[PDB]
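Hi L.,

You mentioned the student needs an example of a multi-chain input paired with its predicted structure. This one should do, with 542 residues in total across all chains.
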Amino acid sequence: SRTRRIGLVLGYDYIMRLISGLGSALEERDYSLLVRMSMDDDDEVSILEDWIATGNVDALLLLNLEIGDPRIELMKNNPQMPCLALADSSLTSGLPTLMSDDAAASGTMIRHLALFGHKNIARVAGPEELGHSYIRDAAFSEITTELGMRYRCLHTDYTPESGAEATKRLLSVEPRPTAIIYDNDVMALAGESVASVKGVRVPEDLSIISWGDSFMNVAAHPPITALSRNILESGRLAAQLMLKLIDGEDVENVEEPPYELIERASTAPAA
Amino acid sequence: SRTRRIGLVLGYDYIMRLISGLGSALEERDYSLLVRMSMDDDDEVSILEDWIATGNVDALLLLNLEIGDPRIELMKNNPQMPCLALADSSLTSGLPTLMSDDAAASGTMIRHLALFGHKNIARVAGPEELGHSYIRDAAFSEITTELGMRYRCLHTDYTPESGAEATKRLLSVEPRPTAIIYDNDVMALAGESVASVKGVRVPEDLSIISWGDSFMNVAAHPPITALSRNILESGRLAAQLMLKLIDGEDVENVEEPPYELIERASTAPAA
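Structure written out for the whole complex:
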């Protein structure tokens, strides 16, 4: 029998666009998304175990895979429950995956800076505990080294206060980077505001790129160059893939839809 | 019997915070949110009718009430299905409501501008088809008139391009307003950027307020004064109220948690 439900556990406190894309495909088959909220760290596993034991959904969507995620083992020990992970293939261990390509995106951003003559750049990244942290760092280190570009990074907690603090630090230590890439839009904006208050012109003295795009980047002063992921289409593909698994079709891993570097006013030749 | 599900139909293409708050309360009772997506205008009613006919959820959450919303009539003709609306009480016609107070918020923002000596202000609002459009306009017109303040408004579609266009228009027509209130954060940011490009200093020449708060306002240049709604707690209260209805308890309308005007650098005395 079918419940016509897909399970998703969210963390308490991007996702909206993913849910819109998922819904655009689930509606075609009169499916619904069943959403629960994990308030703690082992809470998600407990909810998933309940769903599996009761057969309360037809498939599970796994987001934000960490290194050694306890969910992979859960799914592998329960192959009668379809699941799909949205992650780099290196983190999913054989489970059906809609694959991101952070290493590719890293290259696209760095080559854009290289073309503009940047030789000293920095990244303001998220927490080191993210499953994509080591993929991104390895890509940035390899590409920058191979292009003879100086590279430094600082970790933050995604808040504008943290992005602001990191930017102040990068702009105060000689030799000052001429471009900074931020792991989210809010920190790129906070960093641009820091540069402006400091009298560091964007983009004349400092280029800025946001990893991730939103209306915020369009509204900024100046508008911020962004690596844009097609989250809507990713969501749609994810739902289609889970429906295939539910239908009993074999599903090879699928690359997520291509990203695009949207060039705006915040990147320009290096000072 | 109980399904332990609450139904929510979202529109294709705030809500994330609401869902976090809802989940914080639903998890206490092992309830889930069942989410579907309306792709058209009469799509929502059809989904709701299906849920009602099959008893597939225990209660329905109604958001974004319009004037003469076809959902009110649906719910009233189906009182065996618990529901809760998040709206001004004037739009819900006796249905259990978690009540917003846009007129109160309007007063708080306008009094803040009055204290700073503003005598000519403007609003960049959303579409006129919003159910809260006439409540807000009536409040702004009454309060401004009664304080002897000149007031004008322009309608937009919530995009930064639309907010930018509206700001250019307001700043180009004499007498230029000394403060602009925007119906969302992205337009307040887009408007602040327009003022900066134009050489209109914020806040020295122009004060800006965002109706709605987010990290974007904290990250702006300068940070943007915002009317902040407690969406997390609103979500939590909404879930608790629907659970009461499901439990068979009588539920009087409830005011939503108090909003707060967070004063930041973008408001100052009038030029």
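You could point out the following to them. Residues 231-247 of chain B form the longest helix (17 residues). The CA atoms of residues 67 and 146 of chain B lie 27 Å apart.

Best wishes,
N.
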